[model samples]
Target: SNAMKQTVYTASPESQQIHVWSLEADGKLTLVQVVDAPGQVQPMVVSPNKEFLYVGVRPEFRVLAYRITPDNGALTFAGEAALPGSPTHISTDRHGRFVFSASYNQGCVSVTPLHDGLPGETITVVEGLEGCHSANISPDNRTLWVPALKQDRICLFTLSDDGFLSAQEPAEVTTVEGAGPRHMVFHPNQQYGYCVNELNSSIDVWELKDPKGNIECVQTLDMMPPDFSGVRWAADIHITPDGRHLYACDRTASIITVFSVSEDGSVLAVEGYQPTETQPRGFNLDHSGKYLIAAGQKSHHIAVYDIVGEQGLLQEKGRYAVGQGPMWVVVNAH
Candidate 1:
């Protein structure tokens, strides 16, 4: 009993609620709490310290913060802050000092400082991004990257110590003409980056150029199975904490494609693919990198997989019913 680690899994169903579940060591998920969200909820992000969960609510145009209860994975309303745009995705800086959110409809990204587990007034809001889908802070915490799905570009900015965002010299990097870059993740080593393209169903491997967050694409790999032809709709991408493997899920195919990261961090090779819940727009790996949880936006279920074997194949552990239209999955291990 003493060996049980307190791990909490949170998912946002489009039906205006956040479902908090406790993750057992065997990959079973027990619904712990369901917190009411005033509007349709989309994306969620947990603080780096695993203390707070931040979620984006649509139509209401605000971000809500919930204090993650220790041990039981319950949630208590911490605070909420108004946003100028609907946040399609949300993330916190490495130190959890600020919350960064991106809006697809308004094509903007905002940075809001956090105080006492609550979001303060937004310190910086940058507009003019076309279909901005996600925002992330660099591992060094000195730069912020926002991906524009409609423009096919990845915008870069320098973050001031006080939380202001200044556009970098080049400002942005153009992706493949029709890639529709959606979500991104940095390798644990901090030497490489990966982006999932929603339009083309591909992954781009990028090398972080310098301290200013400049990046260069080194490789582009297709996520579709051999000769598969269909509308490509890649949604999310994540790399294991160990930096050995990367996974990207395609909504059109409902499969999570696996790739093995080379030791040098400059390239990736296809490992294989595993079928997942229908229309899995969001998924995440636990802190330990031993388990992956995926949310089915259409199926109203979440599935768990155990990372097994040398190549890090996903073996389906279990599937559990969740709220309707579940879209985002955030796992935090305290």
Candidate 2:
């Protein structure tokens, strides 16, 4: 039951196609299938049950859903829904009841409810105000957490039972004058959250005190190494499954900084960060908590690292050449 297979999805923007690869346990990838889409695919997400895949095409301003065939890992077109504007990112809630898409061009957010048994007719678009780009749902699934990139702040919303977002509350945490909060990741315990500010190159930590979903700004840390001077952009942040370590990516620096997690939902010690092969756009830990797959968009390679103990220190295991600009990595356990 313990084996590894990497499914590589390439956002061939010019080609307007997503190339899928089936990685074998022996660390070899075989060409599986190519799926045709409408426009440039910026972000894509798989359903929680691994039954469907949603691909976001910016030019078309829509997301297409497809039923995944488990046998050959092929996708069948299920349906498509018009979005507010160009969506930069998309994610589903924990229970997979609601789907949220962040529109970059429109500077807004959209919410869609999924049918329990049917994935085709699930989305009901609800548009939010301007400046919303990337978002995540609270672990409890009661609130939607979104970062307004241009506004330089994070906002919260309450999800109604009928799958509509209401009671929009913008958190009081203020970013540095020009720091734009882009993407964020919640701690495994849900007591804390971290966001990567893209423009100003910093990481902001928030203390989520109440289970009712009240968030307070805890601390802000610079992703730049001291004395280093270069243009850099922060991309993504992730916490190890055990909640002991925090990892954030720096595009210009070409490295992922690691931090030791304190009990009070703050990072105390700065563990040594390591250099990535290229611009590490996205990465995720394996379900087993043993391996982390780092995807580099510019380098066209995915690096695998073995997590050491519960500390979140990564040891380079292997590297595989993937397609141009590998954007996201998803693992499906069988």
Candidate 3:
């Protein structure tokens, strides 16, 4: 069926291009398009509706918008806007009405309103967040989470309909010192949250106690191989669509550690690990959760992995050469 067809997008900073691919049922990818970008590409996020792709590019310090071809996964450059700083990561409010971006060097987060699928001037620029790695909005779209990696804290904000951000009560939560919380994901049930700590190579699980988006840390699981004792550089994380398995990648180890989530989404156990492409800064599961694609920044390639069985075991299926610095991957069903 056409519903099973998936389109994959990878952004490469070194090549300044976005490579679009079509995914086969067996986890193979065929390149479909090479869309040139204006600057060094960093992070790219699809809108909640999956109709538009927003990308963060450096030096130019802007976010670019692309209209996603629903049938083929091709991208048409729509528009771009200057940001308050270079965006380390970019996201959208759950409704896709506004674009949220975080800047590492400038220590700030900005919100740009979306008008008819194009980006307007940034309306809010919240600064002073050291090493801001990601700007994530709550499942309800009423709260925002900005993880300050260097500061070891996550800041909370109330998001207004007008694109303004107000600090929530007790606006920040500190992780274990040196944890360096980077990227985070919310459970499909909205009852839990998970953040991958870059410095310590651990995943901090959280209990979402209220609709207002207040949260509490319930567990911190190490994602490193049991015998490894080297520096940890954890990067991207994602959960199966069914909410049963979680996977996080360690760049230093070049492996993806899998964890099985409990029935209540409160706990996790190590399932296993799979060695992947070198220096995997980012990876993503396809919309169907049947395939995983990982981008290797150092190796300049992308690997497709089959999400096999109920254990969520990843079996390498195919790999293809990509542009240099293929750091981010995203997939959408056409």
Candidate 4:
């Protein structure tokens, strides 16, 4: 058994199960387990310490916490907390003391304290977002950046000592009039960030202003090909572990756009786009930085790719057909 192996979890929204697979040395995936949830799970995250997992359910408007069984790769429901609206994403701070969730339908974000690696009984909800979908905490854990889709802007908030949100402000330049900012990811060095606009089929790169705690727009890149005229909706943007490559998923176009990230946090050049098997919703790179597991929501499958480091390219490694509506992918060391 190798500790280097990675566990990939794919969400089955319609079946209410989280399919788990283990990545092998040959860049192939092995079916491990299917963790059951009460409702449709949209987004999930592994604990900072990698001991537990947190899943956000849409219809229930709650977050379910699970304890990872290291021996068998199974998830045991630890606890659950009710959130305000339809929560699409859930993440924990670096210290794993608090859990933050972005509610897509209710237009708000919720915060809850975690006690002993499990969600505590106390819960607090904050209202300011309009169609808030995804969020990420700064490296210093002082600010939380939330992309509010309907508001067409990224909102910043200060996380107080008691796990509450305050002093909200706009992070950077507002998106285009109809650009629906959905999900975002921070660079490995913490000097820049990228957000994927769902409706506009574009990605916005931002430079981090350290002293002022602000993000400045650097550039916007399109995800769709020139000749493709069909509707395109971007979902998630991910930066490689080495911080040299960026990958974005387009739902309508059913493709993943790759780019080379420069040292200054700007897109260097288009590395071209590759067609995926289905509607690309979310993707995650394994711990080894050698494989990428992409979730195809409408197609109910997870496609794995091996990174060709020399030329910064991707090769299809394997595919696992899961349940309906596989929204997000999370890989944990196993």
In model 4, residue pairs whose N, Cα or C atoms come closer than 3 Å (at least 3 residues apart or on different chains), thus clashing, are: none
- Provide the lDDT at 185 for model 1: 96
Please provide TM-scores, in order, for all candidate models, with all chains considered together. Answer: 0.96, 0.87, 0.97, 0.94
Tens-digit per-residue lDDT, 99-188, candidate 3: 999999999999989988798899989999999999888888888989999999999999998989989988987899999999999999
Q: Whose lDDT is higher: candidate 3's or candidate 4's?
A: 3
TM-score of 2: 0.87
Q: Which stretches of candidate 2 lie over 4 Å from their true place?
A: 1-14, 21-31, 116-130, 169-172, 210-214, 309-311
Per-residue CA lDDT of model 2 for 1-334, tens digit only, reads 3375445455544456676666555444566777767777777777888787777786767777878777656778887777777878888888776668888667777876667523344344445445676868888888778788887777777777777766555533567877888888888877888888988778888887756556667788877788668886878777767777778888888888887888766664677788886888777666556667777878877787877765678888888766667766655543
Badly placed stretches (over 4 Å) of model 3 are 1-3, 210-214
User: Model 1, range 1-334, lDDT digits (tens) per residue?
Assistant: 2234555554555667787778867777877887778888888888877778888887888889988877776888889998889989999888888999899999999988999769988888999998999988888998898899999999999988888888897888889899999999998888888989999998888888856645788899998899789999999999998888899999989999988999877898899999999998989997778888898888898889999888999999888877788878887776
lDDT (Cα, 0-100) at 97 in candidate 2: 69
RMSD of each: 2.0, 3.0, 1.7, 2.1
For TM-score, the strongest prediction is 3
lDDT of 4 by residue, 258-329 (tens): 788887666645787888858888888887677778888888888889877644678897888998888788
Clashes (backbone N, CA, C under 3 Å), per candidate, total 0, 1, 0, 0
lDDT (0 to 1) per candidate: 0.86, 0.73, 0.90, 0.81
Q: After superposition, how far is residue 116 of candidate 4 from its true place, in Å?
A: 0.7
